[PDB]
């Protein structure tokens, strides 16, 4: 997958799980400060990424993904 295609899929997952318009899910957006994610949203977002990409993100790694960019970069690195 290209980084662009990963971004598009990540954006879709975030829009769904955090209930925000796709337009607000920019590359630098912070899940908490910019998208208002609460505790339930945080776990739903991680699981959403795991379901969409078929990967496993450890609780440790998850705690480190703060922005859309962090998610995209993490996924692109894992997938190849």
Q: What is the CATH number of the domain that holds 23?
A: 1.10.1200.10
56 is written with which tokens? 């496993």
Six-digit token string for 57: 């993100």
Residue whose structure tokens are 């400060």: 33
> What are the residues facing 30 on neighbouring strands?
67
Q: How many domains would you assign to the chain?
A: 1
**Entry resolution (Å):** 1.5
* Pick from 37, 33, 3: nearest CA to 14: 37
Catalytic residues: 38
Contacts from 52-61 at CB under 8 Å and sequence distance 24+?
52/9, 52/10, 52/12, 52/13, 53/6, 53/9, 53/79, 55/79
- Which H or E element spans position 69? helix 68-79
Burial class (CB in 10 A: 0-12, 13-18, 19+), 33: exposed
Expressed as residue numbers, the domain containing 12 is 1-80
Experimental method: X-ray
């Amino acid at each position: 997958m290209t980084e662009q295609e990963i971004f598009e899929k990540v954006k879709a997952v975030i829009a769904d799980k955090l209930q925000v318009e796709p337009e607000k899910v920019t590359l630098e957006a912070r899940f908490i400060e910019d998208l208002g994610a609460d505790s339930l949203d945080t776990v739903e977002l991680i699981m959403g990424l795991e379901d969409e990409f078929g990967l496993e993100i450890s609780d440790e790694e998850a705690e480190k993904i703060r922005t859309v960019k962090d998610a995209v970069e993490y996924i692109k690195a894992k997938l190849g």
